[model samples]
Target: NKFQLGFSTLSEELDLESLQVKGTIPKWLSGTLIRNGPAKFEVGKEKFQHWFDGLAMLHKFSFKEGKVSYANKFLESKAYQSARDTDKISYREFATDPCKFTDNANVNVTKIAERFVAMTETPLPVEFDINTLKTVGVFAYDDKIESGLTTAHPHYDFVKNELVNYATKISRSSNYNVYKIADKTNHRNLIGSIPVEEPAYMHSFAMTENYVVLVEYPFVVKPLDLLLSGKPFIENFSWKPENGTRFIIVNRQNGNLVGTYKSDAFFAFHHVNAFEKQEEIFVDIIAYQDSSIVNALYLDILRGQKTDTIPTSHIRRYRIPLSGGQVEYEMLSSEAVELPRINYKQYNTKDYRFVYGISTYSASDFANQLVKIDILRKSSKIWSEKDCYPGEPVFVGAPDATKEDEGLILSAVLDATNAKSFLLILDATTFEEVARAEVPHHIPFGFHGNYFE
Candidate 1:
């Protein structure tokens, strides 16, 4: 059987809201013309505009049988309902009104999926079973009106023979609520609550053979301080880190909490990258500090216990007993690697290797580079530490399954004038680039991505 990999790119028109730069600039500056006296600076308030518009998916592909098919969802149009009258802003007032905001309008989701080729032929589809290709997960926000978070994903259970849609409505006051797709196609109803206390936002999830692991970060709303400050409560300026990093494991059949592990240190964003030897879970965790460092942690899911709290800086490799409920942890690497992240793949020959991509923006230097770590030997090597690609590189399986030692890496690069993406095929053993595929257009910053082959 032959396999192919596919990716989708959205039209560069629609804008989506961004959360990172929200409170930094005035809402008016987001849609205003500014002049620095004689300097006359016309800041492109397009940060929000550019960010939201670029929120479209760069790739959404899945492997079925031995072939790959994919789709990208773009925001064709959007409507806003402001919660307060103070939030009113005319789209005509902005210097460059790329996004035309309206009221009570219908946004088309299907049109976005039609922008690219839906399928392709590549030899990377054997990593996962196609019958389990059921859901598309998205993390979205509406900035004009401050609503928490919304997740829209598809679900299918073979025993039930029912293809159900699942979505989550999350806010400060409400724990994450899961919903089922309503019969109306456009509507959905609340089904159940994801077990989370203390407002936390889920970052990424991994569904293994026996369990579903969810990674979450603490959520903080900025309005509570003003109410307690003896002034009239104003809704804005809330920034808090309620708790640190967390990993929750649930039974695959039923979403029952099996064990929960909490880290004492803060995690900017967590990615669960590898499941090695079909037992241990390898996670790439970025520790929150003055200069954030990335570390790896190995957990025996079957033997994990709900402990009080553990340090988040050091890397520990653990041995989990299959009989259930017993873990033995050993320290691995303590050397701090800035912005440490991993891209790992298991070859059909039963050999496993992980590549660590690190960003080198120190407290003084602005340049960044990518580093590859050989986990099998506990050795670290600098693959390419140049100032070329500033963004993270995602690892994908090679186009040919017969040659499992070769791997391809896809990354989004941003320079002074252009924000573009590139694909580099690397020798998995030597960490050297073999070929380069250039992609035009600037793909905005995003969390993590999965490749389908």
Candidate 2:
């Protein structure tokens, strides 16, 4: 097979560094470059090159041998355009309300695809045929809550050139709901609205080959309003512990409804990593509980559900049987490791070990470490730890069974001012420092990456 990889890129004018400082720097002084996004590439005997031909808006790429393919959707849609131009916007613009993109949070381009094979989520679960360089199928959600006829959830069937959208039930109280897009070519049809009894805020979805997992927290007032009112929603908000969390599974073959899982736990921003073992599927959730004034105020407004925790950081594994029907779940392990965050890759060694991830304390700092774990024994070893590199470390490997070493680690380090980025290579097994490559400009923060080798 030819070498192939997929990754993402973004234009940096959004200015995250400055945004972190709350606009301490003049907007005009901030430079524009590709900010944070995902990118993919393959490595073999030749030089590296981009797999996709055109620049993307929001997209994910997959490569197999000599062929490269991608799925893309724009954040701004016709409905959004209409909404922005309507009288509502006119009134809000002048009345002190502000308009913002509905879903602008950062996402991991690589993980979204990986989750599908790992059985993390159900609805938009899909698998890509690397040899064909096309998506097998896509899962989508459609809810009528905010935007009608929009893809609340979407899954793609690249080989058939077909995209399926589904209708969603937002709430029993009102007619507002989620529905899939009708047009096959329209990528927005892939978007799906999640059903939340209360206002759902900061929604995130994960997909496995057979399931889609959507998670959201209770909605709070706009951040600006919360700040101006001096009355935090935490103090007023109340989440029906049972309704705050839900997971829905859909049949990938025909878009049929499967089952749903609901919980009262308040989940923070975390990555859903899943894999298959024997007759069961295992999912690892790395999350944190915030106790800050912001979270507390929201809990208060929600009637004090009190889901907050003391940064009680941990990774919990949920195991589910794959036979379909009713789901069986159990905690494989909780508080498994001390690492606040994890980056992992499966090893094909004799025991099928996995390389667990641990980065340095800060994203901007260059000094951090990456650790490896022997899954079969639940033992860990420090693979490497070096001075912080301005960029996050990305791991890459070869799929061929004959390859000696599994993969290599690629990362970039930024200068003190973050004006420039440098690339470094390390042997995956020995963690021996290999070589360093310098990037001419500063690369902003983003999620997920891939190498083509």
Candidate 3:
């Protein structure tokens, strides 16, 4: 059981290309790496009960000269072409069971301004083809997208290029709709609104430089149990630790609000950097406490239980003092990391200092490293190996680098005692192992990646 057949479940399709390597590659690590997760956890024959209700899969690797190339595809979403013409389960995934189908365009893989996308927690966006990973369809930034629910973590604003996202809109006032998108005419309006009497299952947020925070987690939600509790919108939330984590902020250039702090009960799904200087504002989370790692991230607790998470996630920073409303936090890197990456060309107005991630230990589960996190010197630097299982490290600087982890990290391991899979390359300032680009099989331990040079 290579960890349950190396995460079996598929619509498998691959391309392979000049792969096979174990040394020398890093001619500035040439382009293409692009990934997005969930590799079909069945349909028709029915099989999807979370792992973010699998069914999307797109990986691409493609470097050159030192050679490296590999491909994969699967996103034909329309609930995967209507569960292949109704052989069975037609959507309502996130914990499955609604038969009206909708895994909302399969989670994460963004590009913007030059297009690409694939994101989920949908409101609109699915286009594809970063050189034939195919699936060019589902977009909708005009007509202002109309509905709500949006968060595959959109926050690209190379200083005024614009894309910032966050939407929620449940008719009975869960409306958090804070949008933006103007990398020249991708239009999409509204950069404000926060009236959430209950709704609180946010998957990501925090875009500083002119503020746009949002937090709000006490793991809540209650727009009539997401309109009549048919479950699935993250199971109508519910960890309300007495309604404590707030934050809110907003003012991406005059959309106004700029305040509302409160904090103490935590929970997070990723938000690794958010900045602002002079007047003060920081935000760099990874915190977690309740929501038991969402039932220990069921893939049946990663192929057969012993469930994890007991105050596991680390790295928190939050400090805001734009003239006071109070909010404070610390502990940046007691080390436990998660899919946090940085140096996306000095994201959100710069001030970064390494953070390529994915470290988890679960007390002696021994194996699953690949970290870097120096967060302005708090320190960390791992690489671990042993039957392997990595994913989400993806950084790509160093071309003319001046430090910020000089470059190269790319993950995607999963050897699981040779069922196969590779593409690791490290050396993000000496975490070592600088070469590995195989991938002739086994790969299901994913969630977010992006290096398209």
Candidate 4:
């Protein structure tokens, strides 16, 4: 019953203020960690259907010297504004009303063209002020690249100093447009295009030093059925494991579809890291049995109206030979993991040692602990407290660190016992608590975010 508190709506907004810290926050930890997620679950008296349907709220935890301050504000998208003003759902959410959808940008947050923007599955990204967390309206890209669906999880290429993402145009002739936007530039250059009869439900993809990997699971949607049917957008998807999974690797430099490989049926929401070594590519991800994980997250199910177990997900790695061969995969960790994060600046697109993520001690419980997994040693360390459920663990590397895990893991933790939330800070190397800054109100479980210095 305590876990249900995480799905509750948070209405009140707060300006940045100093919070009570139980332990010392590293003095060098100076930056702002911006997070995005659904914070409003209902419009008037009508509640949203799925956990992902709530309106977007941006949360900021600013650290200066040895103090932490907290602030939150709702992203004023047309969907949020219309719903609030009209007292009715104005836009179609992932599992709410079916058509005339509006961008809520509830999934993730990123910066583009010197503007901080909140993102969702839609192409429209809502800009906001980093300090105030105030909405700056929907950001329009300079180029005219039409796409019906896009991913919130875009990869930043440290080598090229640009952002890489894909956009899918759902039509009778469906295709995926892979593009990249240079740092501080609005115009995006199309790298390549891959045509598909039906596209998979890809929340994220894997990016390597020289390639963009699209792991197309068997979970696909008929192009026209999604448009013609009155059902919700995600409801249009159908899982056919018989078709198996396919990995499409595209050369980021030249826009060439290099190698296509096939693997067994599986579904994943996040890609941890991908790298190339000795003419072979290794792609790591949190894998699930199928897409039932989506339906299991319905508000009704999560709020105790129905009893359903959240599907188990674990880390799995797949190896693709550049010279051409069958793809091989293995389960990498014992911990059930989700909402993963890594030291992107140092090890992303390269061989790394550590991964931090959200995990649960039991199968029935929601994510209640933060886990630090050592891929090289095949070991894991967990940070958990009684009656506390933490969100995604964002790693903030220590300045001038030589080791990969030489940093702190930051997470927004919901302490159900105390009826409040706090910022959970951990020593990345030891997987132990460094400090926790308490918040007066509960922060709902969120998808992903970044720590900007």
Q: In order, what lDDT does every prediction score?
A: 0.32, 0.34, 0.75, 0.89
Ranking by TM-score: 4, 1, 2, 3
Report the candidate with higher lDDT, 2 versus 3.
3
Could you say which candidate leads in TM-score? 4
Query: What TM-score, computed on C-alpha atoms, does each candidate reach?
Result: 0.50, 0.48, 0.33, 0.98
What count of clashes does model 3 give?
A: 2
Ten residues in sequence with the least summed lDDT for candidate 1? 32-41
Better of 1 and 4 by lDDT: 4
Q: What tens-digit string does per-residue lDDT give for candidate 3 at 277-388?
A: 8888888888887677876665766676453433478878888887976688987778788788887666544568677777776544533677787867587877877757
TM-score of 1: 0.50
- Residue 408 of model 3: what lDDT? 75
Error of 4 at 93 (Å): 1.0
Model 4, 100-147: lDDT tens digits are 557899999888987899999987788898977878788989997879
Query: Which of 1 and 3 is ahead in TM-score?
Result: 1
Residue 364 of model 1 has an lDDT of 25
lDDT of 2 by residue, 1-453 (tens): 000111223233221111111111112211111112322111122211211111112322232322223333322322223333552321111012223212211232222322221011112322333323233344333322333112222333333333333432223321212233333222333233344444443224344445444444443223334335433223333444444454454544444555565444555444335545666545455444331323432212222223232233345454555555333343322322222222332321012344444443233221234445444456444433333333344555544424434555554444434344444445566755655434433443333333322
Decoy 4 TM-score against native: 0.98
Query: Which segments of model 3 are wrong by more than 4 Å?
Result: 1-10, 13-54, 57-101, 108-167, 172-174, 177-193, 196-204, 207-257, 260-272, 276-278, 282-340, 343-351, 354-408, 412-422, 430-433, 441-453
- Kindly report the root-mean-square deviation of model 4 from the true structure over all alpha carbons: 1.4
